């Protein structure tokens, strides 16, 4: 009748009477969990305070250890006993490292220059962050360098709209399918609605649905307070310089605005020129690979932020978002990507690709050089390789899958 915390103590202890705190921490990191994880704060607080009462500030005997670990014991136990969605995380991150290096050799593409903020980023910035639905984290390359979401925001604001207003309301204004033609084509579907919320027209109408009857200052903070929940309070910023240049060069976008109002695509009472303004702000929100990967993980984890356990989005909002990301998330490459990679992803002109592996993990990949369709060259290459290695394709089978690795099972 041994308690969970007695069990944890004996596994880490390895026959000794006291556990050096450094060894507990080292072991914890090996699971992929960070000591900074919000769900572990109490354990970390207890360790700090309790170690200052100690003669050496290193050694925790059973009862002390049992006390520090109690409040997080189930999570800690899942972690050490290899119960997380990827049980061998160190192995896995080694594979991610190799795919990153491989992608790294692809130096083609051209950095976006429609505004000068984008022009300025070095071609060789390349980072990849992973966050599992259990909050196992890993990064390689440039993962702490801020950049703009640009179109990666589309699926997120659409999720907010569905979360507050429901599917039926939002889809009075916007369709649910791929256009079938080129994204760079201004047109509406059979019922006069933009085809889906991933095309520019659709994202603009969706923008107009959020926090109606309030002002652009309030709308934008409401949206940021949302992205922060999605990211477990990790970095969400704003580029006022991108916002200005986006607005300075907004002719092509305003037309769409005009066209959309003329066809009665906005809700009764819409101030188009302000909606477009709000739309430019949201494109200019800043993330890192690290923080964006938790956002994607929230989407992989059914709307719950994996590093806080907080419900951030309704199930209907998440499911839908993933469905539209599957179909319309990579511009003109969307159908090929669906076919070959088979994961919900969303690209943006800053070089970001937000990727979800449902039930497993989120990922943000970033490299500024873009191919012909406006997708990141390193990012597209990486996403192909991940799915060649691992049985992550939507329509990969979990029992019979050839020479693919399944990271959810142990070697």
């Amino acid at each position: 009748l041994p308690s969970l915390e007695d069990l944890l103590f004996y596994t880490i202890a390895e026959g000794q009477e006291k556990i050096p705190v450094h060894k507990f921490i080292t072991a914890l990191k090996s699971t992929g969990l960070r000591t900074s994880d919000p769900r572990l704060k109490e354990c970390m607080d207890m360790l700090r305070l309790t170690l200052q009462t100690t003669s050496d500030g290193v050694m925790l005997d059973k009862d002390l250890f049992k006390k520090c670990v109690q409040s997080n014991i189930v999570l800690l136990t899942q972690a050490f006993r290899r119960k997380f969605v990827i049980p061998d995380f160190m192995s896995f991150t080694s594979h991610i490292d190799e795919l990153y290096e491989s992608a790294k050799k692809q130096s083609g593409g051209k950095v976006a220059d429609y505004i000068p903020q984008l022009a300025k980023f070095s071609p060789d910035l390349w980072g990849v962050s992973v966050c599992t639905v259990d909050g196992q984290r890993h990064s390689i390359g440039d993962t702490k360098v801020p950049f703009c979401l640009q179109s990666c925001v589309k699926p997120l604001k659409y999720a907010i709209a569905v979360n507050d207003l429901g599917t039926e309301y939002v889809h009075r204004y916007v369709g649910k399918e791929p256009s079938g033609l080129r994204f760079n084509k201004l047109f509406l579907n059979e019922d006069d609605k933009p085809h889906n919320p991933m095309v520019n027209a659709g994202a603009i109408v969706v923008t107009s649905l959020i926090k109606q009857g309030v002002n652009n200052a309030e709308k934008f903070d409401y949206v940021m307070q949302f992205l922060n929940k999605m990211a477990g309070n990790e970095y969400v910023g704003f580029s006022n310089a991108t916002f200005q240049s986006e607005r300075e060069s907004g002719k092509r976008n305003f037309a769409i605005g005009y066209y959309l109002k003329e066809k009665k695509c906005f809700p009764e009472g819409t101030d188009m020129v302000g909606i477009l303004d709000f739309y430019f702000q949201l494109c200019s929100i800043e993330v890192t690979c690290e923080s964006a990967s938790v956002m994607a993980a929230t989407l992989a984890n059914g709307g719950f932020c994996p590093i806080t356990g907080e419900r951030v989005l309704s199930p209907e909002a998440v499911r839908n978002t993933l469905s539209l990301m599957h179909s319309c998330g990579m511009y003109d490459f969307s159908g090929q990507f669906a076919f070959h990679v088979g994961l919900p992803a969303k690209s943006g002109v800053a070089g970001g690709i937000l990727l979800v592996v449902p039930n497993v993990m989120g990922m943000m990949c970033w490299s500024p050089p873009l191919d012909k369709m406006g997708n990141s060259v390193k990012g597209i290459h990486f996403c192909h390789d991940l799915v060649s290695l691992c049985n992550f394709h939507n329509y990969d089978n979990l029992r019979h899958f050839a020479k693919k690795l399944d990271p959810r099972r142990e070697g």
């Binding site: 009748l1 041994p2 308690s3 969970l4 069990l7 004996y10 596994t11 014991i73 189930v74 136990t77 899942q78 006993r81 119960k83």
Partner: peptide
């Protein structure tokens, strides 16, 4: 939960 883990692991480890 806590119960499920405690059964499984006491067995395996003890």
């Amino acid at each position: 939960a806590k119960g499920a883990l405690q059964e499984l692991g006491a067995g395996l480890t003890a």
